[PDB]
Amino acid sequence: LVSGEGERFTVDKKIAERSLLLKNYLNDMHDSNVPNVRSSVLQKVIEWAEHHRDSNFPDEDDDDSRKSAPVDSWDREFLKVDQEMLYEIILAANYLNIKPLLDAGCKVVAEMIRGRSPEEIRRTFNI
Amino acid sequence: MSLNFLPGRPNATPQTACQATWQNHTIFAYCSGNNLIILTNKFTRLQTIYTQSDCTAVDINSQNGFIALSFHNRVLIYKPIHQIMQNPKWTQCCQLFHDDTPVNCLRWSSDNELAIGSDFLSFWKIKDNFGVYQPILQWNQKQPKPVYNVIISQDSQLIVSIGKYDCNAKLWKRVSIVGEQAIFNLTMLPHPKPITAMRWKKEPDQVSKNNTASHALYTLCEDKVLRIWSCFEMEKNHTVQIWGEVPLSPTQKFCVIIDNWIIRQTLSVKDSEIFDISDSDIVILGSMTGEMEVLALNNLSQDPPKPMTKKTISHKKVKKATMLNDTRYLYLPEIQPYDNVKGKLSFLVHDLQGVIRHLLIDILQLINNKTEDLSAALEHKFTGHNKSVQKLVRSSDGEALLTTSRFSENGVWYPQKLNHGVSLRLQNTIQTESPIKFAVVHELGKQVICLLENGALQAWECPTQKQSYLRVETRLKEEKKIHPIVMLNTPEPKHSHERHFTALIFSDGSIKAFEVSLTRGIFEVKSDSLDIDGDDIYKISIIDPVHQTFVSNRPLISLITKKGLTRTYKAIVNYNDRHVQWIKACEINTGIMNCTCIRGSSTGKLCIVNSTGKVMSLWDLNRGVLEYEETFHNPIEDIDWTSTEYGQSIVSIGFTGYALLYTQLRYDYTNN
Helix, strand or coil, rough: CCCCCCCCCCCCCCCCCHHHCCCHHCCCCCCHHHCCCCCCHHHHHHHHHHHHHHCCCCHHHCCCCCCCCCCCHHHHHCCCCCCHHHHHHHHHHHCCCCCHHHHHHHHHHHHHHHHCCCHHHHHHHCC | CCCCCCCCCCCCCCCCEECCCCHHCCCCEEEECEEEECCCCCCCCCCEEECCCCCEEECCCCCCCEEEEEEEEEEEEEEEECCCCCCCEEEEEEEEECCCCCCECCEEEEEEEEEEEEEEEEEECCCCCCCCCCCEECCCCCCCCCCCCCEEECHCEEEEEEECCCCCEEEEECCCCCCCCCCCCCEEEECCCEEEEEEECCCHHHHCCCCCCCCEEEEEEECCEEEEECCHHHHHHCCEEEEEECCCCCCCCEEEEEEEHHHHCCCCCCCCCCCCCCCCEEEEEECCCCCCEEEEEECCCCCCCCCCCCEEEEEEEECCCCCCCCCCCCCCCCCEEEECCCCEEEEEEEECCCCCEEECCCHHHCCCCHHHHHCCCCCCCCCCCCCCCCCEEEECCCCCEEEEEEEEEEEEEEEEEECCEEEEEEEEEEEECEEEEEHHHHHHHHHHEECCCCEEEEECCCCCCEECCCEEECCCCCCCCCCEEEEECCCCCCCCCEEEEEECCCCCCCEEEEEEECCCCCCCCCCCCCCCCCCCCCCCEECCCCCCCCCCCCEEEECCCCEEEEEEEEEEECCCEEEEEEEEECCCEECCCHHHEEEECCEEEEEEEEEECCCEEEEEECCEEEEEEEEEECCEEEEEEEECCCCCEEEEEEEECCCCEEEECCCCCCCC
């Protein structure tokens, strides 16, 4: 439920049910019956889940949605904190099968890389 | 490269700077304290000459490129070590000493002739033996008072002097036709007010005979009146009469002259047809407001007498930096063409506030009657630090610099973007009771915090005059067992400008986290001491971006120990708790035990010079892997890392006299 490298957190909550992996691996259906994620990025993911605890997403049933839309500004600033850690945050959101964080991370990193091209550098950095 | 110099603050002497067109190399020279500064090739190269005395005046020989430099009761003459070459260089060649009077003003003339006026207006020549250049005091005479300004023409017209606040210019013509000990004939040239400036007209084509008339003399009287005095040989019968008058309007405060020489060298025959003013020289009258009027004289140099008059050409107006920065006086060395760059005139300004300005006015635009505002653009600016720089401290936003010395002459500068690269611009001076051992700049330079070797932590506000108003101060106990080694501005978890929690690293641990602020006094914070890694910090180096990034999550100090156990430590602090915590963000164990230099970037890179100092090792902090290793024939004196919000990291490895710049190169899939 928490990374072994000194990682701990709330064992379960409405937030932890946000991860579709934990929808089955969090003792879900206990009557009928995390290792990989790095500690810091685990903290970051649970922070995002807690923040959006009071939100709703169309999940994979968004069809035309789930993409081709601007990302939430708070998510933009929250994820835009480290270039090297964003890829492993995307990987964590992938392993936990959490679609919204995956989509947000991909949007943010795509815009970072697009904005690092020399044309965009000159058009937005110095000009 | 676009390398801009700051050679040294110029003096306030009228002749403290002179531009000169020796062989069209357009030399420039000026005096700065105990130094002479000579800028040779389009001001892209510099030569400085050190003399143990304040330099009074400097002048340059147009004919042969010799420099005459006044100081104390003597003068020095320097000559191009090689008379012709693409990269000229000056070396000491001769000495001049006449009496015990400081040489207040000095100039140069044809064939090694000098008018070295101190209080007596000594006249000399130096060019003998097989290259001894032994001088000959061909004349000597006394004056009513020390010479504030002198001028010398070529040939018979000889010399003129004024003296400070003088209302009559002593013209001394070369009275004697022959003989080394020539006696000079006097004339008074009364003026209605003290002379503000003066200069001879130019006519180098008359050489080598030099026997020519119409040596007109320009002289500005204190009564806002420019005056042109006619001159002729006429068996020495001419002249002490004013040939033309030009009263400046009350708005006008400054005046300058562009000789027919420059116009003839710049404008082509087809272009000369309009406005068709090539028959005489040009005069530009400007005001502090920027507005200026340019006019052309009528037959100002005609050999037969002519009815000289002022004929207007254009009414221009350039920005503030194009005319004057609200200075008390301006000394404007002769405007000359910028070498072979046709159509450009190297206008210079001496602001008497530590700054010389080089403008490169475009003549065709200047005389354009149907023209808009002036197009002059700041090309170079020359200044310098007062005494010396012991260290340079950079604001992490990179927009402010603090120059610190062994003395209290500390300065706060800001980078300034010129038309030619970038140059620094002194904005404030941080007066201190004692040398600053460490410091950190904030608020885009408007607030400064410093720690003195005396142990006092002082906080200044620099909102504007150049005065820096000390707003807060406190002192330490100076236990003389542990000592500070760096000051880290631990960012607050949130962007906060009210207070700047500065951490003093007292060698092994003991982080004195003062909650320094200006609106409220300095404080103290207990938490916390980091792992000193052996009770002795070995060559800690700060980590800082050089761009306006507000991120608080960042490693601040890349500590290292003689065992090579480098460790980058993050900074976390709580304002409410009044305590700070040190977190080891990375602990890459380096393979080098003793390191000459260490530094790291915002992007998780790191650089270490070995103990020998001749090998540079570039390491990745996010992987602990040596990415690069190079061997240099010379020791690595320093290292410094830039960055940008786009990860454009660059590392400058500063060697003895030159600095290499290295940048990351993409890993090539199908190559080495």
